[PDB]
Amino acid sequence: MAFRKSNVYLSLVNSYIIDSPQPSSINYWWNMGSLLGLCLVIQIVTGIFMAMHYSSNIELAFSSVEHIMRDVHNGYILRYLHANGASFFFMVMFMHMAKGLYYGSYRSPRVTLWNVGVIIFILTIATAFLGYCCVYGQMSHWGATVITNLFSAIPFVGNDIVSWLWGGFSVSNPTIQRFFALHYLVPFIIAAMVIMHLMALHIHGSSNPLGITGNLDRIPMHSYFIFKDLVTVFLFMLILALFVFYSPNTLGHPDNYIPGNPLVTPASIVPEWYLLPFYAILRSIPDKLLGVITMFAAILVLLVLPFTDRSVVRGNTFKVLSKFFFFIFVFNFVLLGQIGACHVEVPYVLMGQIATFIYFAYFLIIVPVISTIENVLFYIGRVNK
Amino acid sequence: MAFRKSNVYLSLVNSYIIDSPQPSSINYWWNMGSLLGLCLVIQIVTGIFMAMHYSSNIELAFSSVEHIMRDVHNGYILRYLHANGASFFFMVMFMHMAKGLYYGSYRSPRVTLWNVGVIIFILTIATAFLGYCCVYGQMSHWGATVITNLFSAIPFVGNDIVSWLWGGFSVSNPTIQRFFALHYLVPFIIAAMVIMHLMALHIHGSSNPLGITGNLDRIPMHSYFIFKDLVTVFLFMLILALFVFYSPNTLGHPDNYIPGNPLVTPASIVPEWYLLPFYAILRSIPDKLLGVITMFAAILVLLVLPFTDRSVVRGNTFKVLSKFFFFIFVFNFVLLGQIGACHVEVPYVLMGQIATFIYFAYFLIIVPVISTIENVLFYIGRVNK
Amino acid sequence: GPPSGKTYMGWWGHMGGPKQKGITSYAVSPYAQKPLQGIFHNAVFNSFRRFKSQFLYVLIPAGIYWYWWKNGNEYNEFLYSKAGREELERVNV
Amino acid sequence: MTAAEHGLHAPAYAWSHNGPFETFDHASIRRGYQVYREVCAACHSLDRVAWRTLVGVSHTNEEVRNMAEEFEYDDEPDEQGNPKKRPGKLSDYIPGPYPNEQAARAANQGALPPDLSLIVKARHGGCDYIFSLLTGYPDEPPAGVALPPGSNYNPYFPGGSIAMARVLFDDMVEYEDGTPATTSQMAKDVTTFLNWCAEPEHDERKRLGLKTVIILSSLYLLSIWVKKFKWAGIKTRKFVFNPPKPRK
Amino acid sequence: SFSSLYKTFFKRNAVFVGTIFAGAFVFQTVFDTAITSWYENHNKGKLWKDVKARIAA
Amino acid sequence: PQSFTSIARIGDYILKSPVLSKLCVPVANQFINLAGYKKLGLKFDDLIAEENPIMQTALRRLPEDESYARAYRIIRAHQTELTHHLLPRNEWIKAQEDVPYLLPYILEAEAAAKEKDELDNIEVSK
Amino acid sequence: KSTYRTPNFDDVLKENNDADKGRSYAYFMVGAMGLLSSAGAKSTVETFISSMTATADVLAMA
Numbered sequence A, B: 001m002a003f004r005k006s007n008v009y010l011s012l013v014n015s016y017i018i019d020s021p022q023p024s025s026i027n028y029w030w031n032m033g034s035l036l037g038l039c040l041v042i043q044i045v046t047g048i049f050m051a052m053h054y055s056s057n058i059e060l061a062f063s064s065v066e067h068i069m070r071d072v073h074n075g076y077i078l079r080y081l082h083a084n085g086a087s088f089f090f091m092v093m094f095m096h097m098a099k100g101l102y103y104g105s106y107r108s109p110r111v112t113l114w115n116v117g118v119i120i121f122i123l124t125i126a127t128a129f130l131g132y133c134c135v136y137g138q139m140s141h142w143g144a145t146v147i148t149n150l151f152s153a154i155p156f157v158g159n160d161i162v163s164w165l166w167g168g169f170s171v172s173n174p175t176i177q178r179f180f181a182l183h184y185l186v187p188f189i190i191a192a193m194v195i196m197h198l199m200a201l202h203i204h205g206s207s208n209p210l211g212i213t214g215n216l217d218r219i220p221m222h223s224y225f226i227f228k229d230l231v232t233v234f235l236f237m238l239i240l241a242l243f244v245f246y247s248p249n250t251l252g253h254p255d256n257y258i259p260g261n262p263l264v265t266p267a268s269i270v271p272e273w274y275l276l277p278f279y280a281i282l283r284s285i286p287d288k289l290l291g292v293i294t295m296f297a298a299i300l301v302l303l304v305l306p307f308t309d310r311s312v313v314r315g316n317t318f319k320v321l322s323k324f325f326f327f328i329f330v331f332n333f334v335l336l337g338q339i340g341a342c343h344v345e346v347p348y349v350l351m352g353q354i355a356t357f358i359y360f361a362y363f364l365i366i367v368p369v370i371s372t373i374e375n376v377l378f379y380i381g382r383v384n385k
Numbered sequence C: 001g002p003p004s005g006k007t008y009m010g011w012w013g014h015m016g017g018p019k020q021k022g023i024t025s026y027a028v029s030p031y032a033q034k035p036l037q038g039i040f041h042n043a044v045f046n047s048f049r050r051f052k053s054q055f056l057y058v059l060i061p062a063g064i065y066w067y068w069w070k071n072g073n074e075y076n077e078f079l080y081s082k083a084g085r086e087e088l089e090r091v092n093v
Numbered sequence D: 001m002t003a004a005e006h007g008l009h010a011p012a013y014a015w016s017h018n019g020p021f022e023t024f025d026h027a028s029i030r031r032g033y034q035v036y037r038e039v040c041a042a043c044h045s046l047d048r049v050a051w052r053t054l055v056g057v058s059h060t061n062e063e064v065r066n067m068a069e070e071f072e073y074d075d076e077p078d079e080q081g082n083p084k085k086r087p088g089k090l091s092d093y094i095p096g097p098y099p100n101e102q103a104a105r106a107a108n109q110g111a112l113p114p115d116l117s118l119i120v121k122a123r124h125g126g127c128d129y130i131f132s133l134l135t136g137y138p139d140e141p142p143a144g145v146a147l148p149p150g151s152n153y154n155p156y157f158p159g160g161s162i163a164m165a166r167v168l169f170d171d172m173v174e175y176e177d178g179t180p181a182t183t184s185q186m187a188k189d190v191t192t193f194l195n196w197c198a199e200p201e202h203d204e205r206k207r208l209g210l211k212t213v214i215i216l217s218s219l220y221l222l223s224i225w226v227k228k229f230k231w232a233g234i235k236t237r238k239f240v241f242n243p244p245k246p247r248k
Numbered sequence E: 001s002f003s004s005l006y007k008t009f010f011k012r013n014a015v016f017v018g019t020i021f022a023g024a025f026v027f028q029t030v031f032d033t034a035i036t037s038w039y040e041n042h043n044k045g046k047l048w049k050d051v052k053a054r055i056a057a
Numbered sequence F: 001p002q003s004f005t006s007i008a009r010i011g012d013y014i015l016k017s018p019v020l021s022k023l024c025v026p027v028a029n030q031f032i033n034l035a036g037y038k039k040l041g042l043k044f045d046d047l048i049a050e051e052n053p054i055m056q057t058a059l060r061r062l063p064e065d066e067s068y069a070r071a072y073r074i075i076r077a078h079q080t081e082l083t084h085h086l087l088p089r090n091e092w093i094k095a096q097e098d099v100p101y102l103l104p105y106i107l108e109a110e111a112a113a114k115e116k117d118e119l120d121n122i123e124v125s126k
Numbered sequence G: 001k002s003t004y005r006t007p008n009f010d011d012v013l014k015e016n017n018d019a020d021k022g023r024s025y026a027y028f029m030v031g032a033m034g035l036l037s038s039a040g041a042k043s044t045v046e047t048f049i050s051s052m053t054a055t056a057d058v059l060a061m062a
C-alpha cells in the first residue's frame, strides 16, 4: 500500500486530512472548525514569542507589554495579532457552535463530540480571561477581582477559595504571576481536548446540511476540502489583518491602557465583548448566588440539547418554525450582549431579564415544544385517513 | 463488547495499558520506560507550581528561586523535587538507553522507535539546559554563555546566530526571559514526542530478554505489569525522597548558590553531572569547530547502530564477546564523565582522548567486527562441514 | 489491533450505506471545461434567489429585536433628559 | 446616565493621519513636542518615551542629544560609594516634573495629572477627545452648575468638573517655523505629538498593512478560482436512474 | 493570463517549486519598493525627510 | 427522540376528528410546501435520521426496489444541494408521491422493541 | 435511458479551440497562489525571527 497509509505517523495524517471521506454537500459553515484550529495555532505562536519579552510581576507587567509594543521588533504586530486573534477566536467559535445548533450536530451519534466541545468552550473563555489579566491594566485588575470573586458564592468555603486563588489579601503580585503561568498552560490542555474532539468526530464523520446520511456519496478531504478550507483561511486572515493593521484597538477597551489601580474601579468598566451576553445574564438576577449559578447554567444548558430536541429529523433545513426560532435565539444572544454593554438602568434591566428567560426557554421549552409540533405537522400533512 | 473496548477514549487506554499483550519474560529493565513517564509528570507538575512564584527578569531570577525556597509553603520540596528529579530523569534515561543497547532494542523492526528516542534524548538535554539557566546562579550564566557559543562554530553565520539567541551583546535579560519561556514549552514537545514514541512501540510491541519472538506467550499488561511497574515506581520514589529530604544538594554545584556575575567565571566551574561525558568528548579535541562537531556526533552516532550491528540474533544475552564489550562501553562512558569532572591536566587529557576514541570505536568498529565474528562462531561451533 | 465498537460510518469500499444499483453518474474533466467564466448570469440570478427564500427567517426576528432595542434605547434617553426626570423618579424606585 | 455625567460627545476633526493610507504630519509632531515641553511638562510626565525615539521622527540626533543633556539623571556611585549625577543621554526616558505621586498631588490641590505617553489610546475619543478637552473650557460654567472649589468646568469631561484648568492661550508659545500659535493650533499640534507618543509604530504599521491587505486580497481571490477549478468535475456531475430489473 | 503567453514560458506544465520560490524572492523586493514609493509619495510633505528639508533656514 | 408510534397516535387523533382535521391539515400542507424537501426530489421518509437501531431495522427490511430508489433520491439531493440549486419543477416530488413508504416498517420495529423491553422487565405477582 | 447516451455538458464544455486554455489559466492561478503564499510565509517567519533580535532599548552602546 501507499507509504501515507502504511507508515505509523502518516497514516494518521492520511485518515484525518487526506483520505477522510467527506459528505459531498457540506457547505462553507463546515469551514469554521479548520479556522478554530488556525486560531489556536496563531494564539500559541504569537503568545510564546511575546512571553520571551514579558514579565509577570505586578509592578512590571503593564510596562512589559508596552515594551513589547515599543521596543520589540514587530512586537506591536505580535500583540495586536494575539489580542485581535482572541476576539476572532470567539467570533468563529460562536459561528461554529451556531452551525452545530442549526444543523442538529449535537444529536446522536455526536453527543460526545458536542460535550467535548462545551468543555473546550469553557477552557477557551477561562484562557482568554487569564490572558487579559496579564496586561494588568484597569480592566485586567477589576476583571481579575470580579471573576475570582465568583467563587465566593460557594457556600461555607467560598471566601477561602478566593483567598487561595489570590494568594493573598487581594489581587496582587502572587495573583498575576500565577495567572500568567496558568495562561501558558491551558492552551496546551485545549490542544489535547481538540485532539479528543477530532477523535470523536472521526468515528462518525461530519454531518451535512440535509441532516441525512452522507454514506452514499463521499469525496476525499484532499484537494476538495483542503482547497475549500484555504478559501476561508485567506478570508479570515484578510479580515484579521484589516483589524491588526488598520483598527487594532476597536475591539478593546481604552481603560486597559491605564495601569491597574487597586483603589479605583472606573465608572466606564465593561467586560470584553465576547463575555457580554453572559455578563448580562448574571446582572439580570438581583441575588449574588443565583446570579453566579444562572450564568454558569447558561453555558451548561448547551448539554441538554440532545435530549430536548424531540424531532425525528436532524437539523433545521426543512423546518419552518425551528428556523424562525433559531434566529430569534441568535438575535436574542446579540441583544443580551448589547444589554451587557449598557448601564443597569430602566428599561435595560427588564429587557435583560426577558432576554435571559428567552435564552433558557429556547433549550428547555421552545425546542421541545416546537420540534414535537413539527413531527406531527410532517405526519398529518401527507398521511390521510 | 466491553465499554473499555467500545468507547472511543477508553479503547486507547485499554489498548496501551490494560489489554496490551506483553512478552511473558520481560525483566525489570523493561520498567524504565514507565519511570521516564513518571519523571516527565513530576517535572511538569513541580515546574508549573513553581512557575507561579518565579520571575524571569535577570535581576529577579535568582532571588525568586530563593523566594520559592524560603517563602513559598512547601516551596523547598517543589524545588528539590524538580532539581533532583531532573538528575533522576537522566539516570533512568541512561539506563533505558543502555537496556536498549544491550538487548538490541534498536534493531528492525524498531528503528523508528529508537530514532524517536534519540530525538527525545536531545530535547530532554536541551530542556534541562534551559531550566538550569533560569536559576541564574554562576553556573547558570556561564553554562548559558558556553552552550549558546557552541553555535558560533557554524561558519559564516555562527556569530549572528549567537547574537540572535542572546537577544543582545551577551547573556543578559532577554536571554533569561526567552530561556524561561522555552523551558516551559519544550516539556510539552517532549510529551508529544513520547506519544509518537509509544505509537511506534505499540505496532510491534516490546522485545524481550531472549531476543526472539514474544508472539507465542503473551500476558496482559493489566495486573501483571501494572503491579510490577508499581514496585519500581515506589523504589524510585523512595530513593528520590532520600535525596530530596536528606541530601538535596549532593547532585548540584555550590557555585549555583552564587548569583550570576557577567565579569567573573569561577575557577571551580563544572557542568552538571549528566553532561560530563559529552563535555569530556568536546575537551578532547584541540580545535573549536571539531570539538563541537565531535560532541554532537557522540549523540548522533546512536543512529548508526541498526546498521553496524551485523548479528543475526537480537541482543547480547547469548553473546560472550558482545557482553564483554558492552560493559567496556558502559564503564568507558562513566570514565568519560569522571574525566570531565577533572581539570585539563596530564594524564587526564590523553585518557579523555583515548576514552573518546573508544566511545566512537564501539559503534563504528567494535560492534560490526565482533558481531560478524560471533555469527561465524555460532556457525562453525556446531556445523560439521 | 483490538476489536473496536462499530459506528454508522465505515471507509472506502465499505462506507456503511445501502447497496447501490441502477444509478449511473457522468463527469467531465475540469481541464476540459470553460475557465470559470459561467459565473455571472448563471449564479447572479441564483444568488439572492436563495436568499429570497431565506431572508424572512432572518429578517423578521432581526426586525423584532432591532425595534425592541430602539424602543428601549429611546425610552432610556427620555428618562435621563430633563423632561423625563419626573417619570424617572417614578419607575426607578 | 445624564448628559453631564457622560460628558459631551467629541466631534470628528479632520486629522491628517486619519485614513488607512495616511502617515502623521511630522512638522505637527515637532511643534507639538514644543507645546508639551513649554506647557504640559510642568504637570505631566511622558515616562514611556525614550529620547532616542524622537530621532528621525521630529528632531535630528544632535537636537535630541542637546535636549537630553539639559536634564540630570542618577549616575553610578563613584569609587567611594557617594551618589553622583550625569547629563541625560539618548537611552534615557524623558523625565517627569515630580519625584513622586505625593509631590504631584501636593502641586495640584490633591489631583494627580496622568502620564500622557498613552493618553490618546487610554481615552474614548482619542485625538478628538484630547483636542476638544483642551479647547473646550468655557469662560463660565452653565447656569445652575455648582463647581467644586478648585475645579474647572469642561463639558467634554465626564461629570463636567475637571481638576485641570485651561492652559492653552493664544501666542503663549513662539513656533520655530513661524506658524501662528493660536489655542486651536497648539491643541492640534500637541494632540498629534501625543498620538505619536502612544503609537510610535503608526506610520510603519499602516505601510505594512497596505502590503498585507493587498497580498491577502489577491490570495483570497486566487484561492476561490483554484477551488472552483478543483471542484468543477464534482459541480457538473450528472446522475441518471434506471430502476433495476426485479430479481436476486 | 493568456494561454499562449503561459505556454511560451511553461509548456503545459505547472510552475515548479524552485521557480515559485525564486519568483517569491523577486516579488518581495519589487513589491516592497513599489509600495514604499507609493506610500511615501502619497504622504509627501508630512514625512520627516520632507520636514527636515524644509528646515533649511 | 419522539417515537413514531407517538407521532401517529397524536396525528391519527387529529385526522379522525372532523374539527381538528379541517383546522390542522391545511396548516400542515403549507408547512410541508415551505419545508421544500420535495424541491430537492426527496420524500419525507427520506429525511428521518437513520443512526439508530429502529431505523436500521426498518431500512434493512425495506424491499430492494424501494431501497435503490431511496438511494437515488438521497444522492441526487446531495448533488443538487452542493450546486446550490433546486431540481427542475417537473422533477419535484408530487404530493401524491410523498408517501410514508418507510413508516410501516418503523412502526413494526418500534412495537417489537417496546414489547421486548416490557418482557425484559415483567413483574411476577405471586 | 441508455447508459451509452451521455447527458448534455455543452453548457460547461469549451466550445472554442485551444484545449489548453483551461490548463494555462488554472496553472497560472495555482502558480500565483503558490508564489504569494511563499512570500507571505517568508515574511511571517522573518517577522517572528526578528522579534528575537536585540530590542531597541538594548542596542544602546555606552
Ligand SMILES: CCCCCCCCCCC(=O)OC[C@H](COP(=O)(O)OC[C@H](O)COP(=O)(O)OC[C@@H](COC(=O)CC)OC(=O)CCC)OC(=O)CCCCCCCC
Residues within 6 Å of the ligand: A026, A027, A028, A029, A031, A088, A091, A092, A231, A232, A235, A236, A239, D224, D227, D228, F084
Ligand atoms: C466575521 C469575522 C470572522 C472572520 C472569519 C470569516 C470566515 C467566513 C465566515 C462566513 C461563512 O461561513 O459563510 C458561509 C456562507 C455559506 O455559504 P455556502 O456554503 O452556502 O455557499 C455557496 C457559495 O455560493 C459557493 O460558492 P464558491 O465556492 O464557488 O465560492 C464561494 C464564495 C465563498 O466565499 C467565502 O469564502 C465565504 C463568504 O466565494 C465567492 O463567490 C465570494 C466572492 C467575493 O457563505 C455565504 O454564502 C454567505 C451567507 C451569509 C453569511 C454572513 C456571515 C455572518 C457574519
Ligand SMILES: CCCCCCCCCCC(=O)OC[C@H](COP(=O)(O)OC[C@H](O)COP(=O)(O)OC[C@@H](COC(=O)CC)OC(=O)CCC)OC(=O)CCCCCCCC
Residues within 6 Å of the ligand: B026, B027, B028, B029, B031, B088, B091, B092, B231, B232, B235, B236, B239
Ligand atoms: C537513582 C535512579 C534509579 C532509582 C530507581 C531505579 C529502580 C529500578 C532500577 C533497577 C533495575 O531496573 O534493576 C533491574 C535488575 C533486573 O532484575 P531481574 O528482572 O532480572 O529480577 C529478577 C528478580 O529476582 C525477580 O524478582 P521479584 O519480582 O519476585 O522481586 C524482585 C525484586 C524487585 O526489586 C525491585 O524493586 C527491582 C530491582 O524485589 C525483591 O525481592 C527485592 C527485595 C528488596 O534488578 C537487579 O538485579 C539489579 C541489578 C543491579 C544494577 C543496578 C545498576 C544501577 C546503576
Ligand SMILES: CCCCCCCCCCCCCCCCCC(=O)OC[C@H](COP(=O)(O)OCCN)OC(=O)CCCCCCCCCCCCC
Residues within 6 Å of the ligand: B029, B094, B095, B097, B098, B099, B100, B102, B103, B209, B298, B299, B316, B317, B330, B333, B334
Ligand atoms: C549517549 C549514550 C548513552 C549510553 C549510556 C551508557 C549507560 C551509562 C550507565 C547506565 C547505568 C546502568 C547501566 C545499564 C546496564 C544494564 C543493561 C542491561 O540491560 O543489563 C542486562 C544484564 C544481564 O541481563 P541478562 O538477561 O543477560 O542476565 C542473564 C539472564 N539469563 O544486567 C547485568 O549484567 C547486570 C547489570 C550491572 C550494571 C552495572 C552498571 C554500572 C554503572 C555505574 C553507575 C554510574 C556510577 C557513577
Ligand code: HEM
Residues within 6 Å of the ligand: A029, A030, A031, A032, A033, A034, A036, A037, A040, A093, A096, A097, A100, A103, A104, A105, A106, A110, A113, A114, A116, A117, A118, A120, A121, A190, A194, A197, A201, A205, A206, A207, A208, A302
Ligand atoms: C478550539 C475549538 C474547536 C476546534 C479546533 C474545533 C474543530 C472542529 C472541526 C475541525 C470540526 C469539523 C469541521 C466543522 O464542522 O467545522 C468540528 C466539528 C464539530 N464541532 Fe468543533 N471545534 C472546536 C470547538 C467546538 C465547540 C466549542 C463545540 C460545541 C460547543 C464544537 C462542536 C462541534 C460539532 C458538534 C461538530 C460537528 C459538526 C457537524 O458535522 O455537523 N466544536 N470541530
Ligand code: HEM
Residues within 6 Å of the ligand: A040, A043, A044, A045, A046, A047, A048, A050, A051, A054, A065, A079, A082, A083, A086, A089, A124, A127, A128, A129, A131, A132, A133, A134, A135, A183, A184, A186, A187, A190, A252
Ligand atoms: C488558547 C489560546 C490563547 C488565548 C485564547 C489567549 C488570549 C489572550 C488574551 C485575550 C490576552 C489579552 C490581550 C490584550 O488585550 O492585550 C492575552 C495576552 C497574553 N497572552 Fe495569550 N492567549 C492564548 C494563548 C497564549 C499562550 C500559549 C501564551 C504563552 C505564554 C500566551 C501569552 C500571552 C501574553 C504574554 C500575553 C500578554 C501580552 C498581550 O497582552 O498581548 N497566550 N492572551
Ligand code: HEM
Residues within 6 Å of the ligand: B029, B030, B031, B032, B033, B034, B036, B037, B040, B093, B096, B097, B100, B103, B104, B105, B106, B110, B113, B114, B116, B117, B118, B120, B121, B190, B194, B197, B201, B205, B206, B207, B208, B302
Ligand atoms: C521521556 C523519554 C522516554 C519515555 C517516556 C520512554 C518510554 C518508553 C516506554 C514506556 C517503553 C516500553 C517499556 C520499556 O521498554 O521501558 C519504551 C521502550 C523503548 N524505548 Fe523509550 N522512552 C523514552 C526515551 C527513550 C530514549 C532516549 C530511547 C533511545 C535513544 C528510547 C528507546 C526505546 C526503545 C528502543 C524501546 C524498546 C525496548 C524493547 O522493547 O526492547 N526511549 N520507552
Ligand code: HEM
Residues within 6 Å of the ligand: B040, B043, B044, B045, B046, B047, B048, B050, B051, B054, B065, B079, B082, B083, B086, B089, B124, B127, B128, B129, B130, B131, B132, B133, B134, B135, B183, B184, B187, B190, B252
Ligand atoms: C522534562 C521536563 C523538565 C526538565 C528536564 C526540567 C529541568 C530543570 C532543571 C535541571 C532546572 C534547574 C534546577 C536547579 O538546579 O535548581 C529547572 C528549573 C526550573 N524549571 Fe524545569 N524542567 C522541566 C520542566 C519544567 C516545566 C514544564 C516548567 C514549567 C514552567 C518548569 C519550570 C522550572 C522553573 C520555574 C525552574 C526554576 C526553579 C528551580 O531552579 O528549580 N520546568 N528545570
Ligand code: HEM
Residues within 6 Å of the ligand: D035, D036, D039, D040, D041, D042, D043, D044, D108, D111, D112, D113, D114, D119, D123, D130, D133, D134, D157, D161, D162, D163, D164, D165, D167, D168, D190
Ligand atoms: C497643553 C499641555 C497639557 C496637556 C496636553 C494636558 C492634557 C491632559 C489630559 C488629556 C488629561 C486627562 C483628562 C482625563 O482624565 O480625561 C489631563 C489631566 C490633568 N491635567 Fe493636564 N494637560 C496639559 C497641561 C497641564 C498643566 C500645565 C497642568 C498643571 C498646571 C495640568 C494639570 C492636570 C491635572 C491636575 C489633571 C487631572 C484632571 C482630573 O482628573 O480631574 N495639565 N491633562
Ligand SMILES: CCCCCCCCCCCCCCC(=O)O[C@H](COC(=O)CCCCCCCCCCCC)COP(=O)(O)O
Residues within 6 Å of the ligand: B034, B035, B037, B038, B041, B226, B227, B229, B230, B233
Ligand atoms: C504517568 C505515570 C507512570 C506510572 C506507571 C505506573 C503504573 C501503576 C499504576 C497503579 C494502578 C493500579 C490499579 C489497580 C486496579 O485498578 O486494580 C483494582 C484493585 O485495586 C486495588 O486493590 C488498589 C491497589 C492500590 C494501588 C495504589 C496506586 C498507587 C498510586 C501510585 C502510582 C503513581 C503512578 C481491581 O482489582 P481486582 O482485580 O482484584 O478486582
Ligand SMILES: CCCCCCCCCCCCCCCCCC(=O)O[C@H](COC(=O)CCCCCC)COP(=O)(O)OCCN
Residues within 6 Å of the ligand: A006, A007, A008, A009, A010, A012, A013, B108, B109, B110, B111, B112, B115, B116, B192, B193, B195, B196
Ligand atoms: C500532540 C502531538 C502528539 C503526536 C501525535 C502523532 C501525529 C503524527 C503526525 C506527525 C507527522 C510527521 C511524520 C513524519 C515521519 C514519517 C516518516 C517515518 O516515520 O519514517 C520512518 C523512520 O522515521 C524515523 O527514523 C524518524 C521519524 C521521526 C519523525 C519526527 C517528526 C520509517 O518508518 P517505516 O514506516 O518505513 O517503517 C520502518 C521499517 N520497520
Ligand SMILES: CCCCCCCCCCCCCCCCCC(=O)O[C@H](COC(=O)CCCCCC)COP(=O)(O)OCCN
Residues within 6 Å of the ligand: A111, A112, A115, A116, A192, A193, A195, A196, B006, B007, B008, B009, B010, B012, B013, B195
Ligand atoms: C494527546 C491527547 C490525549 C489522547 C486522547 C486519547 C486518550 C484518552 C484518555 C482519557 C481517559 C478519559 C476517558 C473518560 C471518557 C470516557 C467516557 C465517555 O467517553 O463517555 C461518552 C460521553 O462522554 C462525554 O460526554 C464527555 C467525555 C469527556 C471526557 C473528558 C476527559 C459516552 O460515549 P459512548 O462511548 O458511550 O458513545 C456511545 C456508543 N454507542
Ligand SMILES: CCCCCCCCCCCCCC(=O)O[C@H](COC(=O)CCCCCCCCCCC)COP(=O)(O)O
Residues within 6 Å of the ligand: A041, A042, A045, A077, A081, A237, A238, A240, A241, D208, D211, D212, D215, D216, E032, G037, G039, G040, G041, G043, G044, G045, G047
Ligand atoms: C503562525 C501563523 C501566523 C499567521 C497570522 C495570520 C494573520 C494575517 C496577518 C499576519 C501578518 C504577519 C506577517 C506580516 O506582517 O507580513 C506582512 C506581509 O504579510 C503577508 O504577505 C501575509 C500573507 C499571509 C501568508 C501566510 C501564509 C501562512 C503563514 C505560515 C508560516 C509558516 C508584511 O511583510 P514584510 O515585513 O513586508 O516582509
Ligand SMILES: C/C=C(C)/C=C/C=C/[C@H](OC)[C@@H](C)[C@@H](OC)[C@@H](C)CCc1oc2c(O)c(OC)cc(OC)c2c(=O)c1C
Residues within 6 Å of the ligand: A122, A123, A125, A126, A129, A139, A140, A142, A143, A144, A146, A147, A148, A165, A182, A269, A270, A271, A272, A275, A278, A279, A282, A295, A296, A299
Ligand atoms: C485560575 C483560573 C480561574 C479562576 C478561572 C476562572 C474562569 C471563570 C469563567 O470562565 C470559565 C469566567 C471567565 C466566565 O464565567 C463563565 C465569564 C463568562 C465571566 C464573565 C464576566 O466577565 C467580567 C469581566 O470580564 C470584567 O472585565 C473587567 C468585569 C466583570 O464584572 C464587572 C465581569 C463579570 O461580571 C462577568 C460575569
Ligand SMILES: C/C=C(C)/C=C/C=C/[C@H](OC)[C@@H](C)[C@@H](OC)[C@@H](C)CCc1oc2c(O)c(OC)cc(OC)c2c(=O)c1C
Residues within 6 Å of the ligand: B122, B123, B125, B126, B129, B139, B140, B142, B143, B144, B146, B147, B148, B165, B182, B269, B270, B271, B272, B275, B278, B279, B282, B295, B296, B299
Ligand atoms: C534556545 C535553546 C538552545 C540554545 C539549546 C541548546 C542546546 C544545546 C545542547 O543540547 C542539545 C547542549 C546543552 C548539549 O550539547 C550536545 C550539552 C551536552 C552541552 C554540554 C556542555 O555543558 C556545559 C555546561 O553545562 C556548563 O555549565 C557550567 C559549562 C560548560 O563549559 C565549561 C559546558 C560545556 O562545555 C559543554 C560541552
Ligand SMILES: OC[C@H]1O[C@@](CO)(O[C@H]2O[C@H](CO)[C@@H](O)[C@H](O)[C@H]2O)[C@@H](O)[C@@H]1O
Residues within 6 Å of the ligand: D137, D138, D139, D140, D141, D147, D148, D149, D150, D151, D152, D153, D154, D165, D166
Ligand atoms: O481652580 C480653578 C479656579 O478658577 C476659577 C476662577 O473663577 O474658575 C474659572 O476659571 C476656570 C479656568 O478655565 C474655569 O474652568 C471655571 O469654569 C471658571 O469659573 C475658580 O472657579 C476655580 O476654582
